[PDB]
């Protein structure tokens, strides 16, 4: 589906929110001068989940691959679209006297 | 009376109204992860409301 863009959007939003939460916790820890200096696992889980979701989403929105075999792109071509040369077109055919003389 | 200062100490002023909230969301020691999540979310919600 085309909803992968919204998925990576929500992932990036959650990642930005986790970054803001980490900034707040760092400010608090530098205010109180605690020797633990351990990020809360609550925000660490959010960061990891957002990173995983966003990476899996951008893996999908990157675009699909194409076959390497050239004989696969011309399998639907027909000689009616290969004989025509846009450079050597001539306008003295019957379509001019038939369609709108 | 200040011409004979004998001792001097410099104390830090109290915490601002904004820095007072950082003690609330961090250090409440919620039971589970889902509880601490909603607690921090509500703190940030109060901040965005302000």
Q: Does A21 touch chain B (CB under 8 A)?
A: yes
Would the CA dihedral through A18, A20, A22, A25 be positive or negative?
A: negative
Residue with tokens 């939003």: A13
Token readout for B27 is 């250090």
Cβ of A43 and B23 within 8 Å? Answer: no
A53 within 8 A of A82, measured Cβ to Cβ: no
Residues of A in contact with B33 (CB under 8 A): 41-42, 45
Token readout for A42 is 């609550």
Q: Closest Cα of chain B to A39: distance in Å?
A: 11
Would the CA dihedral through B21, B24, B27, B32 be positive or negative?
A: negative
Approach to solving: cryo-EM
Would the CA dihedral through B12, B24, B46, A13 be positive or negative?
A: positive
Tally of CB atoms within 10 A around A43: 20
Give the whole-angstrom CA distance, residue B32 versus residue B21: 21
Sorted by sequence, the CB contacts under 8 Å of residue A51 that are 6+ apart come out as A11, A15
The DSSP element (H or E) to which B33 belongs, if any, is helix B33-49
Give the whole-angstrom CA distance, residue A98 versus residue A28: 85
Token readout for A35 is 């020797």
3-class DSSP state of A64:
coil
Residue A88 has φ and ψ, to the nearest 5°, of: -95, 30
Closest among B3, B36, B18 to A24, alpha carbons compared: B18
Cβ of B36 and A40 within 8 Å? Answer: yes
A32 within 8 A of B20, measured Cβ to Cβ: no
């Amino acid at each position: 589906p085309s909803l992968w863009k919204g998925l990576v959007g929500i992932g990036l939003f959650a990642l930005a929110h986790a970054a803001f939460s980490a900034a707040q916790h760092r400010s608090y820890m530098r205010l109180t001068e605690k020797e633990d200096e351990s990020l809360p696992i609550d925000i660490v889980l959010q960061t990891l989940l957002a990173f995983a979701v966003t990476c899996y989403g951008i893996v999908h929105i990157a675009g699909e691959f194409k076959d390497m075999d050239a004989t696969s792109e011309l399998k639907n071509k027909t000689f009616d679209t290969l004989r025509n040369h846009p450079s050597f077109y001539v306008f003295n055919h019957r379509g001019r006297v038939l369609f709108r003389p | 009376s200040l011409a004979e200062v004998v001792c001097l100490e410099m104390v830090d002023l109290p915490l601002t109204g904004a820095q007072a909230e950082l003690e609330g969301e961090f250090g409440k020691k919620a039971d589970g992860l889902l509880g601490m999540f909603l607690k921090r979310l509500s703190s940030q919600l109060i901040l965005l409301q302000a």
